[PDB]
Design a protein around this ligand. Structure first.
Ligand SMILES: *[C@@H](C)[C@H]1/C(=C/c2[nH]c(/C=C3N=C(/C=C4\NC(=O)C(CC)=C4C)C(C)=C\3CCC(=O)O)c(CCC(=O)O)c2C)NC(=O)[C@@H]1C
Length: 156
């Protein structure tokens, strides 16, 4: 799968586009277990996707709801995870990644929702601007097209 290389080089660019620290690719497996296939993070932090690589995130919330609002292709922007009035758990994990805000856009590739595209930036208690959110989703879907193209070519 050389297409991953294409993702690697682009994920680093979109990372700078939204002035983010790290940008993760979250794929939905047949069991919706939450597999991270790749992430572009500054060398100043832990890469995460290195020792184990397979970073699973079993979010029973999104699993039971089959993606929830994300299933309808709706994006979500969190300017701050605390101020939003969120419930316990999920937040504890995010705080550990040195992040307090993020943006989630849906990436469709193939027949269903392939995965989500999230970008985080050193806490970042700022407002996610329209210019950033809409471009992130655009590139996300754009990358999914490369997945389709490669699947069409059937790289063997
Ligand atoms: C402990 C209680 C378990 C848990 C519960 C829980 N989750 C949510 C809400 C959300 N879960 C996600 C999932 C993700 N966010 C990411 O950045 C990633 C990596 C890409 C994943 C997998 C999301 C986005 C939400 C918010 C959107 C939504 O609600 O659909 C809640 C509600 C309160 C909250 O939003 O924090 C609860 C109670 N979460 C876990 O991770 C534990 C398994």
């Amino acid at each position: 799968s050389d297409v991953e290389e294409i993702f690697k080089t682009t994920t680093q660019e979109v990372r700078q586009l939204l002035r983010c620290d790290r940008v993760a690719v979250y794929r939905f497996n047949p069991n919706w277990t939450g597999e991270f296939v790749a992430e572009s993070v500054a060398h100043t932090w832990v890469k995460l996707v290195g020792p184990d690589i397979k970073t699973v995130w079993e979010d029973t919330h999104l699993q039971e709801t089959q993606g929830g609002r994300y299933a309808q292709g709706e994006n979500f922007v969190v300017n701050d995870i605390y101020q939003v009035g969120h419930s316990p758990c999920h937040i504890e994990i995010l705080e550990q990644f040195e992040v307090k805000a993020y943006v989630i856009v849906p990436v469709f590739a193939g027949e269903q929702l392939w995965g989500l595209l999230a970008a985080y930036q050193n806490s970042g208690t700022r407002d996610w601007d329209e210019s950033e959110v809409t471009l992130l989703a655009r590139i996300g879907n754009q990358l999914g097209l490369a997945l389709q193209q490669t699947e069409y070519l059937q790289q063997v």
